[PDB]
Design a protein around this nucleic acid. Structure first.
Lengths: 44, 275
RNA sequence: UCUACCCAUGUCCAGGGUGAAGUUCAGGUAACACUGAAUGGAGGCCCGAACCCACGCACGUUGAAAAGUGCGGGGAUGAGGU
RNA sequence: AUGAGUAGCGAAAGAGGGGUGAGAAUCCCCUCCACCGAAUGCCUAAGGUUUCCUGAGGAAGGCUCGUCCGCUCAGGGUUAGUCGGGACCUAAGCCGAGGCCGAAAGGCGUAGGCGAUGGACAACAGGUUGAUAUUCCUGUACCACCUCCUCACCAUUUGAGCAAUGGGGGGACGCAGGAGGAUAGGGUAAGCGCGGUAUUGGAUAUCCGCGUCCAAGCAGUUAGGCUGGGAAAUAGGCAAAUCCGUUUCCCAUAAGCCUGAGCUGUGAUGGCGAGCGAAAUAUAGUAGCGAAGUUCCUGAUUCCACACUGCCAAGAAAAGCCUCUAGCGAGGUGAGAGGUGCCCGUACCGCAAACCGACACAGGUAGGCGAGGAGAGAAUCCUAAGGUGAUCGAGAGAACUCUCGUUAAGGAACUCGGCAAAAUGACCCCGUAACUUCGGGAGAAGGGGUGCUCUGUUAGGGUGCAAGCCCGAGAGAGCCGCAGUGAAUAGGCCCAGGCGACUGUUUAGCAAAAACACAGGUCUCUGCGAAGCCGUAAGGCGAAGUAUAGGGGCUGACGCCUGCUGUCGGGUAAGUUCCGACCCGCACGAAAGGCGCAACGAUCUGGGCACUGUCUCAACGAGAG
């Protein structure tokens, strides 16, 4: 009975990381939106 | 050169195979092998464009010479081997200097025979002669573009063509299919027919063997529902929209021509067989 | 990061079997037949654990569990599992 | 608030004597008893993050209690030239200077890089703390670099060194099968230490325990492979080449070459070892002391080693580490002394109460070891080394529900339907039908014997001077139970018909069937270098394919053929299933019929034998609520 979440640090950083989000313009838009609201944790 | 298996068990029942009674070796030349990976029928975008293609055994590519450029220097046949990426068999020629190349094996070649490519080369068989030979003779491996590109037509097991008349800078030649075309006389070809003519008569036997060669199952377009294929998708009623299945991409495919008009190549064709 | 298909690179499958074949060696027939031996023994073969499925019944159903357990069942060198 | 002091308290064996304490069914110690053992044992991934060690605690959390804890508060604990990763190499894929397309944003791509799940690569034995150890300590080693100051032979094109840019090799590679060799491991006979027994009897063929050892550096070895060497000459390998190919001779026909599991000495006057067991250390047990340490049988799922043989599906990638050629351009070999020869991880749990499931949840989680008896076996039952007592209890033995054990006489009379349960099942011997596509059907169907003693260390073999093991057949005799595979694990068979070969979907979680798809084959139609397909294009797939690729309909396979509602009978004491005749039609240049052989078919429909608590019709007993 496999559940849907299986942890892995490499995949997490490669998909949702900061250095990944800073590649397209849409990722930079996401970062700007997070900064405007005031979140403590930007990206992952 | 065909071996029939005993009906020991279902699956092996009816399976016919070759005897490979022409291959005199079992190892390739480590200097003419090159890597080759599978593709699954996927584009540079990563999407499926060609269906029923994926899987199989691994394979290494052997570099073949379809240009027969070495002219004058003689060479001798050394071995006839097996190539997994083609229908015919290949031959290793040891040139006088010591170059070593692979050539499409002509029908009836044997170790020892000394080959010769060039405008002054003799007829015999395997000899690559430019388009200046007799107005008859089984010819194979022909270059459409002026010499330099390499043979493109008549290159598979059992295939054979014939030279007819010569029209100024062109040569009338009948193609395997049955069509006749004018080929720039500047081009070159070889002499003889491609071998292993028993390739057209082998029963695969079981689904497994087909999968080993890289072919995936095919689902009838009729059974798939109308979203995926034009017409189909029934459970308990008489055929739903069926009896006119059409191609899966919404285009006619029965007695429908495809040769594009304004071909700009309708000046060199003369007869019409399979267009 | 679940699941569908594809690409590159690794790994797993206790034991047993009437016994298939091609093939070869001898007797044997002009040779096919027919005897022995080897061939072991290839095969989407057979019985069967690990492993993978999910066919029947019963229980559970404000459950131990938002899809399970118990007892039987199918595949098990391959169009295999991971 | 009500329901209500009601339902539940989440698989499992404990009992007593001490202890401590304000307080003990639940915490510590002891002794008996019980459970797992191809794991509930050990080592170690991913993931977790301090959960690890010691001293205090009794607010909250532990489905009860608690003096206890993976909980709370304070202190501590992780040591590398050799282990894993980086100052090494590349795969799929990704990024991409110039560049090509595109209203913009952007898409693609060359040179060049990044990227292990793979390739290269120098260390082993023993000891120690409350918490780390190929890292600390003690012994013996190896690898790359330098000459601080050295030392001995040996210095300039009188060539030392030199690689690519060349070439070899790797990296070199698939699947299956069966010999051989050798070890890891498992059990005897000498030997060494203990004991001579209060229940009848044992000084004895009596009982208990023990019986070794590294890497290196020495020597010599099974086996394996070569394609055999030697001399000349070169239209090839961007220049070069003595290197590699190629050719011509000469001799072979045994030399030579290169790889090796393992064994014998030396590492070792070393260190391990049954058991003796100091003080008091804090009375532990350590300090400390320490005997013999051999021969014989049986051995791989490990190593030689993808080494050998066969097969077609043709098999591995790739590059570097390595040798060797020349283009380039002076010191090399062996000792002594060094650099200390950098960075990151190192605690603890990893079949689980520390990970994923909202929980201290009967679920899920790559890999390496994985003993004995009986046994073909990693099956089954009982046990080694080792681990555990699984966190609510007392007592009564009502109805009822669930999980189990028996049952008089009948057996399918039950029911939509033998659903469910019962019966068979292990070896060895004899025998084995119609029908076939000749392989099958076939463990068809059906009958017989197994325990224990003596001839008997049987004949023989292997095993090996022998001894010690087996496969030990095969016999004879003779004893005794109701019972001989005495427990646990292991096919119920037999007749007639439709539909479809092994496989996949199931409709992950109401359908796994004739459902349904697939499939080897058949047929038709388009493509001569392409047709198709994806994109606005650029760019690709087809394909480093050349009558091979698309698309359609068919489809076991293989055949033949060939296109390509009666009513009656016959079954049951009382009949759908099948008949042979009635057909009513035929539709069918394909399309039908007639073709079950096999299926390993969890398929649908009829009928027999055995067996039974399914029932006539219920009765006791065991455990949980």
């Amino acid at each position: 009975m496999k559940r849907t979440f299986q942890p892995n640090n490499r995949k997490r950083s490669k998909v949702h990381g900061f250095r990944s989000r800073m590649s397209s313009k849409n990722g930079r838009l996401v970062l700007a939106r997070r900064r405007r609201k005031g979140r403590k944790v930007l990206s992952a | 050169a065909i071996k029939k298996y005993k009906p020991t068990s279902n699956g092996r029942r009816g399976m016919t195979t070759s005897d490979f009674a022409e291959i005199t070796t079992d190892k390739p030349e480590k200097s003419l092998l090159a890597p080759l990976h599978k593709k699954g029928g996927r584009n540079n975008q990563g999407k499926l464009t060609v269906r029923h293609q994926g899987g199989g055994h691994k394979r290494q590519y052997r570099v073949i010479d379809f240009k027969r450029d070495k002219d004058g220097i003689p060479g001798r046949v050394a071995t006839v081997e097996y190539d997994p990426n083609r229908s015919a068999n290949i031959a290793l020629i040891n040139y006088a200097d010591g170059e070593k190349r692979y050539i499409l094996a002509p029908k009836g070649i044997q170790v020892g025979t000394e080959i010769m490519s060039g405008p002054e080369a003799d007829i015999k068989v395997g000899n690559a002669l430019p388009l200046i030979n007799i107005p008859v003779g089984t010819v194979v491996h022909n270059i459409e573009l002026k010499p330099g590109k390499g043979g493109q037509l008549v290159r598979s097991a059992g295939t054979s063509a014939q030279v007819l008349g010569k029209e100024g800078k062109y040569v009338l030649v009948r193609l395997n299919s049955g069509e006749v075309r004018m080929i720039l006389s500047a081009c070159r070809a070889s002499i003889g027919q491609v071998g292993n003519e028993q390739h057209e008569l082998i029963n695969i036997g079981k689904a497994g063997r087909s999968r080993w060669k890289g072919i995936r199952p095919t689902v009838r377009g009729s059974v798939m529902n109308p979203n995926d294929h034009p017409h189909g998708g029934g459970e308990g009623r008489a055929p739903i929209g069926r009896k006119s299945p059409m191609s899966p991409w919404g285009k006619p495919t029965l007695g429908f021509k495809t040769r594009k008009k304004k071909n700009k190549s309708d000046k060199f064709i003369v007869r019409r067989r399979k267009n």
